[PDB]
């Protein structure tokens, strides 16, 4: 593996940008074939089957993806703080799901309910309709620039959309379309 | 029967046990305070009912129907606390309908409304909510009594059902009669009191209703807490029992995997 | 360190009875609130 | 194994009926030896140690035994409906074990308690005393006709015996012996 | 393992005794490495850190260590009864310590308050100073014969020394120095 991989590089005479697809047998990331491949990469995206069964596409695992340029001195401070703030609340969501199993949903404190409500809305907003999947979903694709991506999550973290249902954040592009979807949902009710 | 399934199933119960274990102490801490405040309210509750005790009053055979009140909370995981009350609530109505009355049932506590909704949906007069989260107070009994009189329904008889705290490991279900009807109150035995009037008796019955309601609530809360503590103890005992067999199964499978994977290497080395 | 150590979210990863029981309750509880939120949105927008 | 098994058949000159006993090493059904014999059979009967621990004899697993002639057009409609109903009731009770083992019986609603009681009553009635075991069990052998079994299971499924204790359906023959043993055990 | 361990025995001229340290891989007591060793052992000694937290030295767990010559036919009758009683009292004290953390100290009956004090004294009579650490702590070492140990524990179990304070039994040798040290205090 090492002999072949070392030839795909950007030397001082030119540049090569490579994208490689890797298969994991039986969803086991400790298998010797994918295990000895993490060392040869600069950015990884891990797809998961649990997320796909909820209906969220693309099924990217948000707590198991990494990059090398995720540094405050390369992408700025605002972009860095937003991502770390998202990951922290997504990690905190998991611990609350053990309590709900034994004692019901309504016995939780109000702060826990607010945390869960914000986390569920954050989870939906990460999905997006693609352009090559118009046959499957039946919608037209979307593209989102970077500034809208930062601002939409910063606003949801602030708490400016606590008066909207979850369904308005599902399969949309920018943040401006969720309220326009909620207004139509209200009109059709 | 693979190693992954055993590992996941072990890791779930390991968390369930700790959740139950942490939930036991909170019920003990609440039970301490619930027991502390019962003694001052017991003398008040007994003192409210002395007059009816001394001068016996018996209701006649009328047809103004009853007013059955059942007390409970909005939380589960307390053994058979609610089922015992809901058992007698439906028992009394059969005898009441044998004579024939327009009886109605009022329940404070959501579980009581939920259990008996299917078969007694029409008899429901009014129900309350937000009970058990915080300790009860006299103002809640005042609110319930105030909202009970404004109803156009009128009754000649009534009863209230509750659980009475007896010991840290036992309790008894009981009910007490209500003679709040003015007409039945005015009987021969009341002639000894010689400064009475209709207005005075109306106010007196009004106050006795709130007194009985407050006494019943302060009796029921302690029994509910003392039952939840025992339930949360038994659940952790069962979880500790399960996590002991799963470990032995895990160890046996772990050894078997190593032996099976070594045999293949030896066999593929010998055939060269 | 040698034994089996659990983590966070292990109850919903095994997919037993408790995981589905946990999922349905959240689904119901958050299915209930959207009606109130939509009704208040319609009333607010009609008022102004 | 295929060379030996293919000779025990029924042809256009006669008939042969085979009854074979098979062994499973270390209580494992995925072992290569007993896992290739399933394809050479027309009827299967699987025995379990856990059932034998509870005292039910014969220890036949009711959710793991099959036959090739269980269809409405051979055994009739009524027999098939009764068998499918009892199997559905048995399957439903198995899915509540985790909750009962920890939280307890009080958390169930009324219908779940009713299904638990009916399944526990049905489990007892499947046991039976054998004649060849009378010497070391102190009982008497029994032999039931088919119609009585069908009717006895129909009656239990209909709820006609919900007022009897569950211990009266243990080690008896026809259904009439359950009411008499319950009457004595007042 | 057999060829080595069979050379440590007691012949007519003398004897050899061995003390060995054990490490259990993966906390599995059925692993082939420690399971083969346990067939040759005649005793165990468990050292814990919780005992060391209280300030007990040597930190030997009394309820977790075991022997094999602990039988009336070998060590005698009086020794066995005394060593049984100490284990009984120390076992019940640990169970009642759970009650005192939930219901409170007032739920204890009259006998419980006496058993607690006797257990608390016994848990401190088990410590002892060593000679090899003489210079560091400035205390003489003590070497108690077996008879004084039996008598000292028997007299505490009777209830005779039920008026001296707890700290008289801490870091002492035979029983006399405890009453002398209690005399010096107060």
UniProtKB/TrEMBL annotation, chain B:
A single cellular component GO annotation: mitochondrial inner membrane
Pfam annotation, one family: ATP-synt
UniProt subcellular location: Mitochondrion inner membrane
An example molecular function term from Gene Ontology annotations: proton-transporting ATP synthase activity, rotational mechanism
Membrane topology: Peripheral membrane protein
PROSITE patterns tied to this protein: ATPASE_GAMMA
Keyword tags: Acetylation, ATP synthesis, CF(1), Hydrogen ion transport, Ion transport, Membrane, Mitochondrion, Mitochondrion inner membrane, Phosphoprotein, Transport
Keyword Ion transport: yes
Keyword Coiled coil appears in the UniProt entry: no
PANTHER family named in the record: ATP SYNTHASE GAMMA CHAIN (PTHR11693), ATP SYNTHASE SUBUNIT GAMMA, MITOCHONDRIAL (PTHR11693:SF22)
Family: Belongs to the ATPase gamma chain family.
Assembly and binders: F-type ATPases have 2 components, CF(1) - the catalytic core - and CF(0) - the membrane proton channel. CF(1) and CF(0) have multiple subunits.
Role of this protein: Subunit gamma, of the mitochondrial membrane ATP synthase complex (F(1)F(0) ATP synthase or Complex V) that produces ATP from ADP in the presence of a proton gradient across the membrane which is generated by electron transport complexes of the respiratory chain. ATP synthase complex consist of a soluble F(1) head domain - the catalytic core - and a membrane F(1) domain - the membrane proton channel. These two domains are linked by a central stalk rotating inside the F(1) region and a stationary peripheral stalk.
UniProt-recorded name of the protein: ATP synthase subunit gamma
Lineage of the species this protein comes from: Eukaryota, Metazoa, Chordata, Craniata, Vertebrata
UniProtKB/TrEMBL annotation, chains D, E:
Compartments where located: Membrane
Superkingdom assignment: Eukaryota
Protein's UniProt name: ATP synthase subunit beta
Encoding gene, per UniProt annotation: ATP5F1B
Full protein stretch here: 381 to 566 of 570
Function of the molecule: Produces ATP from ADP in the presence of a proton gradient across the membrane. Catalytic subunit beta, of the mitochondrial membrane ATP synthase complex (F(1)F(0) ATP synthase or Complex V) that produces ATP from ADP in the presence of a proton gradient across the membrane which is generated by electron transport complexes of the respiratory chain. ATP synthase complex consist of a soluble F(1) head domain - the catalytic core - and a membrane F(1) domain - the membrane proton channel. These two domains are linked by a central stalk rotating inside the F(1) region and a stationary peripheral stalk.
Residues engaged in binding ATP: 68, 71
Provenance organism: Sus scrofa
Family assignment from sequence similarity: Belongs to the ATPase alpha/beta chains family.
Subunit structure: F-type ATPases have 2 components, CF(1) - the catalytic core - and CF(0) - the membrane proton channel. CF(1) and CF(0) have multiple subunits.
Residues involved in ADP binding: 57
């Amino acid at each position: 593996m090492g002999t072949m991989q070392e030839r795909i590089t950007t030397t001082k005479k030119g540049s090569i940008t490579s994208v490689q697809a890797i298969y994991v047998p039986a969803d086991d990331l400790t298998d010797p074939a994918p295990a000895t491949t993490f060392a040869h990469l600069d950015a990884t995206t891990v797809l998961s089957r649990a997320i796909a069964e909820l209906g969220i596409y693309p099924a990217v695992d948000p707590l198991d993806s990494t990059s090398r340029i995720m540094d405050p001195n390369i992408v700025g401070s605002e972009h860095y703080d937003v991502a770390r703030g998202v990951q922290k609340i997504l990690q905190d969501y998991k611990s609350l799901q053990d309590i709900i199993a034994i004692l019901g949903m309504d016995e939780l404190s109000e702060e826990d309910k607010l945390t869960v409500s914000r986390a569920r809305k954050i989870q939906r907003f990460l999905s997006q309709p693609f352009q090559v999947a118009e046959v499957f979903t039946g919608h037209l694709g979307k593209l989102v620039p970077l500034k809208e991506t930062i601002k939409g999550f910063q606003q949801i973290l602030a708490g400016e959309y606590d008066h909207l249902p979850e369904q308005a954040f599902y399969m949309v592009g920018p943040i401006e379309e969720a309220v326009a979807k909620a207004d139509k949902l209200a009109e059709e009710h | 029967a693979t190693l992954k399934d055993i590992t996941r199933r072990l890791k779930s119960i390991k968390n369930i046990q700790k959740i139950t274990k942490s939930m036991k102490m909170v019920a003990a801490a609440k039970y301490a305070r619930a027991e502390r405040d019962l003694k001052p309210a017991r003398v008040y509750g007994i003192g409210s009912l002395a007059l009816y005790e001394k001068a016996d009053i018996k209701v006649p055979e009328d047809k103004k129907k009853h007013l059955i009140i059942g007390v409970s909370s909005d939380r589960g995981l307390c053994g058979a606390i609610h089922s015992s009350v809901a058992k007698q609530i439906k028992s009394e109505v059969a005898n009441l309908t044998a004579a024939g009355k327009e009886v109605k049932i009022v329940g404070v506590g959501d579980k009581i409304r939920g259990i008996l909704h299917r078969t007694h949906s029409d008899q429901f007069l009014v129900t309350f909510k937000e009970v058990g989260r915080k300790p009860p107070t006299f103002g809640d009994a005042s609110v319930i009594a105030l909202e009970l009189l404004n109803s156009g329904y009128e009754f000649d008889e009534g009863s209230i059902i509750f659980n009475r705290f007896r010991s840290v490991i036992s309790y008894k279900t009981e009910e007490k009669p209500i003679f709040s009807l003015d007409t039945v109150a005015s009987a021969e035995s009341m002639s000894i009191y010689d400064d009475i009037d209709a207005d005075v008796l109306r106010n007196y019955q009004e106050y006795s209703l709130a007194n009985i309601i407050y006494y019943s609530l302060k009796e029921s809360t302690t029994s509910e807490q003392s039952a939840r503590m025992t339930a949360m103890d038994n659940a952790s005992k069962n979880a500790s029992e399960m996590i002991d067999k799963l470990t032995l199964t895990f160890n046996r499978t772990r050894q078997a995997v190593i032996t099976k994977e070594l045999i293949e290497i030896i066999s593929g080395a010998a055939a060269l | 360190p040698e034994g089996v150590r659990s983590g966070a979210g292990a109850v919903r990863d095994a997919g037993g009875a408790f995981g589905k029981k946990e999922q349905a309750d959240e689904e119901r509880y958050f299915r209930a609130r959207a009606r109130e939120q939509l009704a208040a949105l319609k009333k607010h927008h009609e008022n102004e």
